[PDB]
């Protein structure tokens, strides 16, 4: 279970990603296990009572996320 589980603090997951042409080391520290879950090719977001589902799915070392019309791709830094 890659939930970033930790002893007493909150789930920690440090991700060295890269979308477009700008890399970012994402720090994922959620104490409230919610936020974004995802089944099939779809990312569901519980944005304060107002749930919305944006398409996203991965292929190889690349993950496509339809963000605002655009269909950007994100991959891992090496």
């Amino acid at each position: 279970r890659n939930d970033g589980w930790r002893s007493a603090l909150a789930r920690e997951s440090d991700l060295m990603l890269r979308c477009r042409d700008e890399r970012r080391c994402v720090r994922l520290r959620h104490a409230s296990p919610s936020q974004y879950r995802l089944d099939g090719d779809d990312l569901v977001s519980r944005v304060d009572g107002v749930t919305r589902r944006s398409a996203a799915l991965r292929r190889g070392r690349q993950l496509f996320l339809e963000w605002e019309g655009e269909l950007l791709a994100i991959e891992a830094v090496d």
Binding site: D3, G4, W5, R6, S7, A8, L9, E12, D14, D78
Partner: protein, 537 residues
Amino acid sequence: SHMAILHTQINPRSAEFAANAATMLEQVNALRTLLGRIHEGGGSAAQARHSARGKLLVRERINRLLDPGSPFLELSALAAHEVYGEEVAAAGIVAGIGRVEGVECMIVGNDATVKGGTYYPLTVKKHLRAQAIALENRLPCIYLVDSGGANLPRQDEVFPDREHFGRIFFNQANMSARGIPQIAVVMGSCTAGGAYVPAMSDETVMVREQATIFLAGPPLVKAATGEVVSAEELGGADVHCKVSGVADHYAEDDDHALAIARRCVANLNWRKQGQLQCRAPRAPLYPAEELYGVIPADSKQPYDVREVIARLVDGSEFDEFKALFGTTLVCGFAHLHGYPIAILANNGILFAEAAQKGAHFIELACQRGIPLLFLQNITGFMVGQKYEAGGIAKHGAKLVTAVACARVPKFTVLIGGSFGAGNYGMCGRAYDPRFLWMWPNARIGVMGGEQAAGVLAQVKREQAERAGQQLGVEEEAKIKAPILEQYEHQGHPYYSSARLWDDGVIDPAQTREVLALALSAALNAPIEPTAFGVFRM
């Protein structure tokens, strides 16, 4: 199996409930907040002065090296809390268990920011307790070396004795012999002592223009027959990768270095040796946070432990052995996240019957190679005159041999009080449980505060009575004053976990989560048959 079910008796909405739950969740928040303080390291101060040098911080090196999003079970974080004069966060060394290329691994790295990463007494004890867990459960090891030396001022508790530094190398080469890979990544200085950590390791990695492995750094080397040389020329990264051979992989920086290490763990051709009849993982039947309010707030207040069990086992299914006999000790089989486990939890005192019941259980557990789970909340054995003439002695001994001799993986969690003989009969620190943990509410002591201030002041007035007088409430009260408070302080989780008397303090509501992680991780190594000593019947 709709009968091996545990139907709760607790009302989650009850006032008394939220009562206990109140101060329980409060203690947990006390821990949550200190731990955070401990992640500070040598403090924002030098912590920044660290990233200055282009060096990733220790806890970061850790998260970069772990599998994407993998869990991480930390080890004694409260290490050396308020122990030495100064503040040496998590003892200047972080270490724990996490996935690296799909292998449950033991990771240990020093905090260059904490008093120069030098080895304080408890640092050495911590570093060794990591290699126990690693040898005991067969987990490959990655040491992220970046330390000064040994804390010179307190060398007498760091250098000599068996249990001191240097047993670090002993354990290392033994593990390497037992086939438990030994990897090293030097990301800083590594003078004298720590110089062997990289030299004695199957595979070794160095960051160029950062790492340095030399037996005697420039300070000590100029102190030799003169000679004045730089650190990188003395024992640099380039010296030990192209010339000497004390290193094996030439890293460009901390990030490279860590990804280089992953790859070594990658071709380990590693396979787990443990082996139980684990079954489909099914969750509890009651939210595991309900616990916060299950444990009373009045330390000396009785509660039914079967309540804490129903919130940990799978489907709160628990078949009880010797159901109604020596009830002060609850015994039963269950499964936890698939893995089948034999539980032993305290329900009060501990008369002779509870020990016989407990011994006979361990026997069953040991014969079927089912792992052991001890839930400590014992106050001691029932005293008295017919109780002693009844063998409470010998019988309590029967439970102790059984525990000490039991060779399947054992696990203890302190959920109440570890006091006296109890701590030993229930798999305490000294009986080598794979891992042993503590709740924020539990207290450990040789005996209660006044209980010991009782005897201690007592004989003081008996040696002074068969001497022609007695102890007046004046001097007797001044003899119990100190004890009463000393005990209240040396019984608290922080005081314990600081000295590694346990592998840490945990969130009562995460208990189950830790246990599964632990279990799984100890299956990296084989469940051995068990051989008992002689049982004094």
